[PDB]
């Protein structure tokens, strides 16, 4: 149980054909973070079971991630049915929950996804007896006294999970950056493609964004260390930034020479977002609706979302988190700049380059 999870059945040096001994069930495996977690587990020789609700075309990318027989795909998942949850975890000694929601729909509310399903999942996990680890994902700004509904339902579900499954680990990362993220992508869709970009108040609320590969490494580091069972970890990058600094960094990176943002009082932003929030129910959910066009985002922007003092973070897992503002994490937003990424004139350094290279590049 302690460190018998990672040692007792480990066969091979740890590549694609090796065996790690982990059978894991990842809920929400076709999502943004879940795909990276499923890739992290399967590449080391673990069997990963992936139930999903969507069409098979949106889950086909998970089939590549592991050797023959080690990626198991279970379509038509209904999380209101306990039989599907029971079948999906029936051979697993690790359960990882990445199921979450950002907007409400006439079929699904925040309590159904953040409260009721994690409680029933923790109960059915404790019923089996062979599940040695339950990794539940919540947010850094989760709080029971939060005006935003999703943060409050997330904290309530964290309490229910720690109640029903006492050794379950609660993971609370900050904003996650990546190619398919929900943080820079919507901010770039707000800087471009709109007449103006509203900023709540002065934009001085602080955040701690983190990289998706560091969170994927954090899950494996949690599975290694037995002490982290039953704890709560906050995952945040090495830099604390305000939203105005994030907007300035995106405007400098995109090479946009016209600041289209406008600072607005919070009541004005809520008055803008109110007509498309009283009609969010009785509707099956519309494409290209931003998760920033809600009052819950406005309430989140009136507070800090950072790692608390004395909390367990990346350093207790042995991980030095990568920088988010520069390097490989900022390379996808550099592709959306005006004109294209491109190299340059490339002629100052081609002086003492050999003969065929300059003609090959037509310099």
């Amino acid at each position: 149980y302690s460190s018998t999870l990672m040692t007792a059945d480990k066969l091979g040096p740890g590549g694609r054909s090796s065996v790690s001994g982990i059978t894991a069930t990842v809920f929400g495996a076709n999502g943004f973070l879940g795909s990276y977690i499923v890739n992290e587990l399967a590449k080391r020789g673990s069997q990963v079971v992936c139930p999903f609700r969507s069409t098979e075309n949106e889950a086909m990318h998970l089939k590549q991630m592991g050797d023959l027989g080690q990626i198991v795909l279970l379509p038509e998942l209904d999380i209101r049915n306990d039989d599907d949850i029971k079948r999906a975890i029936s051979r697993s000694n690790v359960i990882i929950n990445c199921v979450g929601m950002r907007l409400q729909t006439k079929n699904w509310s925040f309590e159904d996804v953040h409260v009721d399903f994690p409680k029933r999942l923790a109960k059915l996990a404790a019923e089996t007896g062979q599940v040695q680890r339950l990794i539940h994902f919540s947010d850094m700004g989760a709080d029971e006294n939060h005006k935003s509904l999703r943060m409050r339902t997330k904290a309530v579900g964290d309490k229910e999970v720690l109640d029903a499954f006492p050794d379950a680990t609660i993971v609370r990362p900050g904003d996650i950056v990546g190619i398919e993220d929900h943080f820079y992508n919507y901010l770039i869709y707000q800087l471009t493609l709109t007449v103006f970009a509203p900023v709540v108040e002065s934009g001085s609320n602080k955040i701690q964004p983190t990289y998706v590969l560091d969170v994927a490494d954090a899950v494996a580091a949690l599975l290694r260390k037995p002490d982290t069972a039953g704890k709560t970890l906050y995952l945040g990058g090495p830099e604390v930034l305000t939203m105005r600094e994030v907007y300035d960094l995106l405007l400098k990176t995109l090479r946009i020479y016209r600041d289209d943002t406008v600072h607005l009082p919070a009541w004005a932003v809520k008055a803008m977002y109110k007509p498309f929030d009283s009609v969010r129910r009785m509707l099956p959910g519309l494409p290209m609706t931003s998760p920033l066009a809600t009052e819950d985002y406005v309430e989140e922007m009136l507070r800090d979302k950072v790692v608390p003092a004395g909390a367990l973070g990346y350093a207790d897992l042995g991980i030095v988190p990568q920088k988010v503002t520069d390097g490989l994490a900022i390379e996808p937003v550099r592709h959306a700049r005006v004109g294209g990424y491109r190299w340059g004139d490339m002629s100052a350094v081609a002086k003492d380059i050999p003969e065929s290279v300059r003609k090959y590049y037509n310099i």
Binding site: H335, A336, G339, G340, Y341
Partner: protein, 286 residues
Amino acid sequence: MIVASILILIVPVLLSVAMFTLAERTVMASMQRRFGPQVSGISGLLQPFWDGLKLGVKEPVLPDSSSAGAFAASPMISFVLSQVAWVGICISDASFQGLVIMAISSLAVYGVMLAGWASNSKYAFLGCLRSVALMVSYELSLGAALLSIGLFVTDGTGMKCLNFAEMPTTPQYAMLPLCLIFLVCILAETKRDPFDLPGYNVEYSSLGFALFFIAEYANMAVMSAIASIYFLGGFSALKITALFFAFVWTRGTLPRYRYDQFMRLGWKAFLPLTLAFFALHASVAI
């Protein structure tokens, strides 16, 4: 009533474009001793509609290195020009109707060149100039052919015009070589065989691509109607079908030219021939 007449014109144009692209597949198959589309609907009669609906739910690829406005504008410009040219064929009474359609078809070059400028491909820029050079080179022979045609078009009051309702309703036997040159010029404008070497829509997907092909087939139908008006004694459904069958028949049986080969053909054969025929017809018309 004008909006109603234009929409009632637009409906058979798009229906006919779908049936043209199906009929091209099936006639090309029958020349090659096969069947062509038969499964998709009874006798394959739903294949263009499922192609259109498949492209409708297809993902639009917007490259994040191009200029989005010109990239969107190029197939829209092509489609709009094809529809406007059809309106000029059927919902006009103008004195210089053939000149109007020649002016519209001279505008159709812009979609190719905007696609070449917008998309950041190395050989899209290379092929757009070749396609524009081909269309530009054969437009002059089309214009000189129109000059030869207009020397004999007079209405009842005695005024010379290019009005389509004043054209005679008998085939123009005196202008058979000019008719053949006109048909090969139509083949050159639509980038068909044997001039199909240049493609420019290599970066387009879904309904922008669909707009490109609807514009191409509608322009082919425009030029077919124009040739039937000028040389075949009128505009009719049978003549449209027969000329389309002839174009598919030529596409089945011939190979294509090199770039410099059709450039030499258009600048050393077709233009001097149309100009010499214009001088001869002007000598006759005195």
